[PDB]
Symmetry: D2
Subunit: 465 residues, 4 copies
């Protein structure tokens, strides 16, 4: 009686099949185009990458690995996953006899948890940079009464902090505490840290306690491939990372691991990690995303990419320099990478407040706590990254105009705080910011300008989509 | 290097990947895709996956985000939840839903974390009886599944003489094990589950009754099988398979009197996941809207019609169908009913371009000799195949099996089936037959449309 | 203040009149009563004499040959001697069996074995409590875990057929395939029958699990060969040193030595390491001494006859209550005890209280499926150590019988909403309680009370 | 067998029922009489106590508690357990409105484990003084590859150390680490520490992390009752202890706990601790031992006992002073209690060697590492306690002659180490002490004068057995 319209329902372009969702995608693209994206974890994926996501690769189930699958008809997915692993090892200049890699993790958090499952039995001890000091949830997060992060729930985690007076990680206190905590694995990775990680030192600390040194290069993965920051692959046993962010691919994760001699006493990391990801934690691999990651890896090895990362770091340096010239304090004085933590205290306000004033001006960036911050209830900083805007073509001069936009945003934030009063609440702040001509007026002007400037730049991706 | 490759198309930026995708699209077109868990996503859905939604981080939930600029992602995730609850005819005052799970397995593990603390006891169908890894799975050594590592799982089996679940033995064993949660869901079970009974057993032990409708999610939306939302406290599911969307998962939960919402939500984040995959959420949304169309409803009826026809055909051809038949989209064929196993069959059928996988089957020689083949109809039905067509498919599979009992008898009974794969290889005689059959199968499958983008 | 040396020497009778009276009042209580609690016995004078030796003063952490303190020469003779006698008493070969005699009690011994062979969260399988299992074999509810074995380990129980009172070895065999136990327990606290160790062994091997026997209740029966030995099939056998072995309170852990499935057993190191530096501290040498003394007495002919008599009495008692129309689970017993199903129209919950008021000691048992104990467990070791024979145990059966008539009596006068109420016996009852108590105590005083004089 | 032989076997005095054993006992008593017992954990139980152990109380099964038993006929055991709890709460000057106590623990280690089980679920975090610094196994013990103490096996333990330069506990580092470890319970108790514990400071640290402060007064329990050292019952939520050692009772343990309002409202320790001991971990109580503990408690409240404890501390002060006058170094310079940790390094040897030379001279005492000691194997010190010998009546003068005996012991230990050859060690040392004349003749001489003097003092007990 039917089955006639059915064929086309599964054939029409998104625009007609569902106007609502399509309308949402179009307003998102406009939003991304006129705004100044400064969130350190954001970037814009190339057309080639996005083009792969929508392929028929979405349809195939390939549980297992090349050579050892559970389904039939994986010949092409096998070339794909294999090809992707080749490029992944290549992109980071790794030798196949000394390194192996898994490309099925669904995202960044899944990769980390998989490595914990494979090498750290349940309740095994894990050590990672404390959250308020730039750490990531997946590195463990708990309070004096509740285990929040799943890494803290299924395992025993204890954090190491950074020196409150330098913003640097306290390798000395980590070394000492590792002897009392007996970690099975130590994490070398940050989410809001503007400096390089002393992997060499961390490696010795691990070896002293027989622990594994796992690096989480999610934020600097792209910087590493381009050689603008030391590689973690020269000290760590395992390296996990997201494939988006500075690597500029689609969302997914990878787990790199050592192979060979640690021929007396060998690395049995491959078997574990692989079994952990499957049949351990994941099910069918998302081949379409694996393709996207593959495409990204190939672009990542081009000189244009190395060029891009070069510029990403230069821009952070210009931004970092301009805000300083304007009197803003930068945690640890500056950066070695794509981001910087601005301690808004030097201006008499917090990132909790600036977060809002700036967002209303189409300048995206998120609040974050600086060393010593009394409460996470009122974070003294703002994290700023350059990958996104640099993928847009902005150069040093441009980022200097950005620093000024951000600056004005902070002044309004302070101007408004003058009214609310010191003891004023955060709810009261948004209230006063939301209901006041003097302010709303300024917000209309700033926003206008910020957007005007953004509109002057291209926006990578499926054309206006 | 003032070059901007951020725009050059895939066909130019990466010919290698481009080829693999082209070769995969042709492979999918000329083959008879019978794997029960596969389907072909619509073009609209795939289109969404490549949108700019890929670029936004929106950790948390609408109303409660950690980032700024989520106005549109909020409208999306919210829209998706509306459609999810709608598709299954659920009342928002009684049901809530989380649409951030990255896949099917992540969704289950999230529910376990939220409702079953570590080491909590879970009960699910034993895998060899059609259960899924994520429902727990272990041995006398390295527990394969993570659900079996961070939790204490004990399985319930199906009657070996009927292929049916032994709800009686589960009821008794639940009194000794004290499960905190019981799973109602299958990966290879041709029948409807007695949710009502499973509900009565959960309550008897204060346990939660979690349904995993991943395999019949599409069947359920179109009302071709009873709904699990009628008895269960929680229902999780993939968004692909019979729902025909992109890969992702969802978690439905009860609201009223009951704080499953808080836990589940906190479990997915900041518990187990990070940034939501908005582009995939969009894809699931698009699929949900198509799932509520009449065209979808008929498609599902057809999917089930085809399964019966196929089942019937293989039966008329003397093949053993576990429990005699099916109420859904799949059937477990008991090999050995022709004198062979799905272990080798999967390999030859595969060489003939007929895709389907072997399956543990009730007890059998577990992993050593899967006395069965699982066959599903969603994928081919999305292609338009009707009963008559599936009748011809049954014959193609049949011939595949005859060519299997063949190479087997021609293979030493010591069965170095780890070379059988090699005896299929090179041996021009079998490779000859493989081609003869493969030819006919591809000619026949090309007669039907391949959903998705163009020849991409 | 200018003394103290006086105090250290003064007899307890002077130093503590309160405790002394308690001891005397407890000794008289034990003398005039009919002790039927299956887990109770009367230690000999020799044993009790050892408990008060100077052995109480030495710390000897570790083992003979490998101590952490100095001056253990004599404690080393002791522990070693005790181990020799322990293996001997059960006719075991040192090349095949080894033993650890430091466990503080029965429950500590089991927990030590679990810790040594079953890492945390390891699965253990044991007889369900209501079916005669012991707490230490795991015990939990739909809601919470009551036993530590159930808290630091994942336990699943196996039940006894509700229609026969017999263990369902079939359902255990099947369930063991789904649960994957790392260790299965062969032992009971209230089961009148012999366990099928051979079958239990065939089931452990099928799952690669260990077969641990808990012979606490029949330890004495085993030494005298009045019941099959668990050392014929089990990898490990734990046990109390009191109960039917008639020693002081303490536990032991026997283990296999040699090769399990060699083809070109290290239970010793593990268990030993588990007891120390694992779970315990300083051994209780004075108690080890008391266990040694009891083991030597356990190998005498006088002990063997005693055990035969213990079983003879149980049969007689069982038979008598049967002829009295009482329900004995599984119809009878192969050992020292029997589970009486008070159905007579009452329960062991209230029975225990009245019989207790009549000076007939025995506790309520959790018969096969209700906080509402349905039966009464009765043991003969204690009274038999007193010299009672069949004829005497026949008169005991009647004393108990009358006790039940006075019980099943107040239950009609009761609520039926019993509870703290029923714990009221009015004089119409107190008078009877006294009439029966007299008759019991007078008969009870016809027999010798082993051990040191109650004064 | 004639039931008269059976009835008599159960009636014969030990001397006749078992010769081997009765003979062992007799040789042990002789040994204890002629030797100088200096091991800090050793003491001599009174006759009254031992007399209680052998009572018929051995026979009764009384699972549960007074008022709520599982067996019938506990009338007298109920007076006993109740009586014992009254005295336990009394001896320490505790008010029943604020404190309760369980007297069924079989020993010291069982009491601690019971408290962990009741208040700290499995894998809960526990913090205790590191073993090498004077901690006890039950407070947790593990290495960088294996959990040894059961406390470390069924729970997550992390230790807090003492300052290597003072021998004092580092309350500052504990405070800091507690914030990263999030302990659920902190242990205030030592096995080899000559100083008082800052319970008030530890209590604040617990409260800062919502943790319970558990004190383990096994070593100073008797000192506390007599008030010669501050009481732990002033700051701790729970106090566990052995009943032997300085309390001079039979082997057993007790668990004291708070009752009433913690600050909430209230304290919920009673139900848990009691449920943990049973049906949790233990079975039938050892009533005969509970009686012994009761008798000891009554003696513990006499003025003779308080007199004894003062003398115990006075003797440690004389002994400590004498060894110092002879040039021996005492960790932390001295002691506030019954023991002292001598750092044999000042003489060029170790407690591993002195342990043996001194034991062969009938002078009992055990080796023990001193702060900083280069990873055990060769522990620098010797622990020395005075309870045992003081219960024997030794006074200041006497303990000065002991110091001299010990001194000579060390010289021999070094005279032979002179033949040793610095590098040649361990198994070789003993081979020389027990293999060449001059020394043996030296040992025979010393030993003799040691035993003679020892035979000049009484020996608490059954007057011979
Ligand atoms: N009912 C049902 N069907 C389903 C699923 C499901 O969850 N349930 N799946 C989900 O949606 C897919 C299958 N997924 C599975 C993935 C892993 C394991 C598993 O048992 N894992 C172990 C042991 C297997 C094992 O090692 N196998 C044998 C033979 C080797 C092997 O690969 N065997 C093949 C061929 C079988 C044969 O002919 O021997 C096999 O399929 O088992 C061994 O001892 O080494 C592992 O090591 O990964 C099982 C099923 C498809 N069909
Ligand atoms: N087969 C057998 N017989 C044996 C033993 C054995 O191990 N096995 N024993 C060894 O050699 C002795 C008995 N020892 C026992 C010790 C504890 C429990 C027990 O069930 N444990 C807890 C449960 C509490 C419990 O879970 N509480 C519930 C209510 C259940 C319950 O029974 N309620 C009341 C009792 C009824 C009443 O008076 O109201 C209660 O206060 O516990 C809760 O509300 O939290 C207890 O305290 O009774 C049973 C027997 C003698 N006979
Ligand atoms: C006992 N002493 C050990 C020592 O160092 O000499 C002890 C105990 C254990 O008691 P036990 O009867 O179980 O052997 C527990 N806790 C402490 C602090 C000490 O000191
Ligand atoms: C396929 C399936 C899953 C898991 O799906 P993935 O996204 O591949 O993890 C979960 N449950 C059931 C019942 C399934 O059939
Ligand atoms: C009595 C008994 C125990 C425990 O003995 P306790 O010394 O009181 O802890 C253990 N197991 C069984 C089978 C028992 O009968």
């Amino acid at each position: 009686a039917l089955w006639s319209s059915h064929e086309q329902m599964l054939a029409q372009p998104l625009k007609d099949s569902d106007a609502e969702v399509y309308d949402i995608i179009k307003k998102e693209s406009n939003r991304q185009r006129v705004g100044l994206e400064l969130i350190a974890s954001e970037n814009f994926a190339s057309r080639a990458v996005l083009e792969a996501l929508g392929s028929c690769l979405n349809n195939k189930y390939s549980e297992g690995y090349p050579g050892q699958r559970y389904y039939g008809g994986t010949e092409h997915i096998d070339e794909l996953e294999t090809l992707c692993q080749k490029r992944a090892l290549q992109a980071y200049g790794l030798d196949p006899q000394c390194w192996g890699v898994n490309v099925q993790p669904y995202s960044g958090s899944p990769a980390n948890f998989a490595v914990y499952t494979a090498l750290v039995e349940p309740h095994g001890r894990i050590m990672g940079l404390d959250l308020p000091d730039g750490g990531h949830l997946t590195h463990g997060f708990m309070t004096d009464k509740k285990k929040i992060s799943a890494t803290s729930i299924f395992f025993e985690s204890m954090a190491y902090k950074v020196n409150p007076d330098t913003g640097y990680i306290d390798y000395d206190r980590l070394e000492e505490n590792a002897r009392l905590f007996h970690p099975k694995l130590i994490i070398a990775g940050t989410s809001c840290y503007s400096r390089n990680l002393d992997y060499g030192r961390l490696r010795k600390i691990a070896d002293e306690n027989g622990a594994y040194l796992m690096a989480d290069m999610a934020h600097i993965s792209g910087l590493v491939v381009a050689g603008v920051v030391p590689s973690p692959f020269e000290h760590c046993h395992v390296v996990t990372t997201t494939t988006h962010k500075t690597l500029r691919g689609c969302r997914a994760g990878m787990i790199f691991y050592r192979r060979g001699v640690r021929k007396e006493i060998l690395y049995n990391l491959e078997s574990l990690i692989n079994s952990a990801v499957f049949p351990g934690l994941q099910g069918g691999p998302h081949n379409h995303a694996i393709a996207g990651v593959a495409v990204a890896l190939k672009q990542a090895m081009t000189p244009e990419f190395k060029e891009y990362q070069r510029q990403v770091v230069a821009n952070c340096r210009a931004l970092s320099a301009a805000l300083v010239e304007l009197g803003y304090k930068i945690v640890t004085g500056g950066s070695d990478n794509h981001l910087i933590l601005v301690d808004l205290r030097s201006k008499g306000t917090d990132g909790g407040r600036a977060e809002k004033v700036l967002e209303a001006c189409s300048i995206a960036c998120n609040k974050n706590t600086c060393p010593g911050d009394k409460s996470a209830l009122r974070p003294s900083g703002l994290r700023l990254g350059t990958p996104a805007l640099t993928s847009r073509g902005l150069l040093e001069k441009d980022f200097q105009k950005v620093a000024h936009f951000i600056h004005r945003g902070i002044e309004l934030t302070v101007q408004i705080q003058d009214d609310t009063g010191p003891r004023a609440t955060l709810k009261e702040f948004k209230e006063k910011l939301a209901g006041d001509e003097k302010h709303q007026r300024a917000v209309r002007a700033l926003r206008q300008e910020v957007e005007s400037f953004a509109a002057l730049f291209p926006l990578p991706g499926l054309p206006g989509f």
